[PDB]
Amino acid sequence: STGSATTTPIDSLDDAYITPVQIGTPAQTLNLDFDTGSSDLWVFSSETTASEVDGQTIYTPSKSTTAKLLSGATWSISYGDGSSSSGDVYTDTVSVGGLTVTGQAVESAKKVSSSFTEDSTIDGLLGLAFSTLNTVSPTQQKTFFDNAKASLDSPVFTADLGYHAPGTYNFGFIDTTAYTGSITYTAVSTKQGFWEWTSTGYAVGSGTFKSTSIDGIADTGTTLLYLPATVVSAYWAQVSGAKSSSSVGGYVFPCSATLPSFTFGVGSARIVIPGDYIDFGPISTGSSSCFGGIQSSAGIGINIFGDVALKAAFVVFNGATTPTLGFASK
Template identity: 55%
Template sequence: MQPITFGSFLVTFLSASMAAGSAIPNAISTSGSFEIKRTENKGFTGRNGPLALARAYAKYGVPVSKTLTEAIELVKSTQLVKRGGSGNVTATPDGDDLQYLVPVEIGTPPQKLNLDFDTGSSDLWVFSSETDSSSSQGHDVYDPSKSTSSKKLDGATWNITYGDQSSSSGDVYTDVVTVGSLTVKTQAVESAQQVSAQFASGHNDGLVGLAFSSINTVTPTPQKTWFDNIVGSLDSPLFVADLRHETPGSYIFGAVPSAASNILYAPIDNSKGFWQFSTSSDIGGEFDAIADTGTTLILAGDDLAKAYYQKVQGARLDPVQGGYVFGCNTTLPDFKFTVGEGAITVPGSLVNYAPAGNGECFGGIQPSGGLPFTILGDIALKAAHVIFDSGKTQIGWAQKK
């Protein structure tokens, strides 16, 4: 992984004169709000639609079928890059289908890792010196023995198991974790000892969970998320996801940027630990939805996905690809969903996710596989500034122009 000093890492204070928020013992802040730019994942070589769908299914416990697994390998096999007369080399897609990551510093002196900010989970876990070398190859790792501030949390373990039985697990340390201008002095850092192939084949060095701490998987005592630890040092108890299409975008902590105007708000039901709210669509009725930066696609109820693609000429549910496909030159309709008293529009251009071969493309909206809620992943989040407001237990969406 490319270190921060050679990447596009940038922390921007939203206002140079902004006073620091009220401090809490575990956090050190140099600003009451800050913006952190995501960096390009240098290991990302292409989008794999079936892979993105399988990853989302696995995350939420939906069984990943043999057909979908075969579709992933089919896409990989067609992604061959020809370089003149030098032969063929395989361009293997990122196992986590993540094009942009966030640089994070852990330990004393700082160890730099590139992590995925995930509002659909609540664990901060990383590849580490304890991870089997065959699994950690190609990753930057956290080595607690090289940090003077690390302390093992005796008896604490963690285990994340997905619906396809892939998993990651290990032990837990507390250490200094810095993102942007704010440091948590004793953040729980979950050190991976066992990592499934799903994660090992990816290029991110771990995850920063930004859902609610109630679903943290550390036992016997769940740990607070990084955000919950720093929230008292922010000017406002919120963060904003400003994700963008084919450019890194950023996360803003402690303030709502001026570019976010005409914000629509909806109350959050956090009883399951997610950023979940009630919404509706004119093509699918009312339903619950989760805003998840750690999922690429929109996973909609089967009827809602079917209703959307009924509006797309030639679209079909392809058993070989494991999802809906359509002609790549097709102009897709917008997808709209309500937030409070208004609605957000996801441009059809964002729904055209990835080439699927033979002139067809894989859709960014796919069936949820029976989940009791819709997942609004990056396809939807890129259409708006999304405000995750823990102070008022609400979520805001501000349409991008």
């Protein structure tokens, strides 16, 4: 089997991407944030504290003839950005772009933190990291990909995120028309439960490539590109007037600037992030100070190849016995 679904930016800055997901019988369609940095499929629901729902589409398990309460099961998660959610668990039928899993753990939110409430465009998350990170207790549950894997034509999914435009998540096949040149594959460590790999270095604009190992994770659920302070300083040094602002919480730059590109290495291959991808607009409405899309990972404890980096590539998440990551230009 295979699946193919379109993923759409939630706003004009590509702050995140939503993908429609069918849950239950009859189908209830929710727009979820496909997140290769976590491993819980959770949804706004009829069980969510009413005051914490503000415009999201909810899952109502009592209206699904295939929903079954997973007795005694609870979940609770906190994300790198400080957000959190928790609740109970159902199993139900879940389909993504024509690909169907029966008995998928659907984690129903009783509580969500304010950032989720305040974002009406995201109805929940669909985790695509390794199932070892799943928070359901006392019986850990598998991710959607893990549940589908054996049925897929090939045990892979691919992320093709758009810049200021829709993209695609495919399951079970590699669309050879979706990229240019070849796919370069690189080793993955699953020891932290992430799609963790090692970039071979970087360049700023037309500058010379610096060969240097950068360990980090391929994370569709993080907006920006988070890299070591040395690297990030090297980048913003090329932008007149850019500075790290403690009060804003990162590097800012004059909105009148033209940003240089940023290149990262995948083995011998190179992925070029155009400068425009690194502009995330005014820090506050009407400001002429703009927020940078490349930021320091110092204090996160891990480097994150988030959407800013991933949207410049066609990315293969290969879930073979020994997982690997593939990157191609597009």
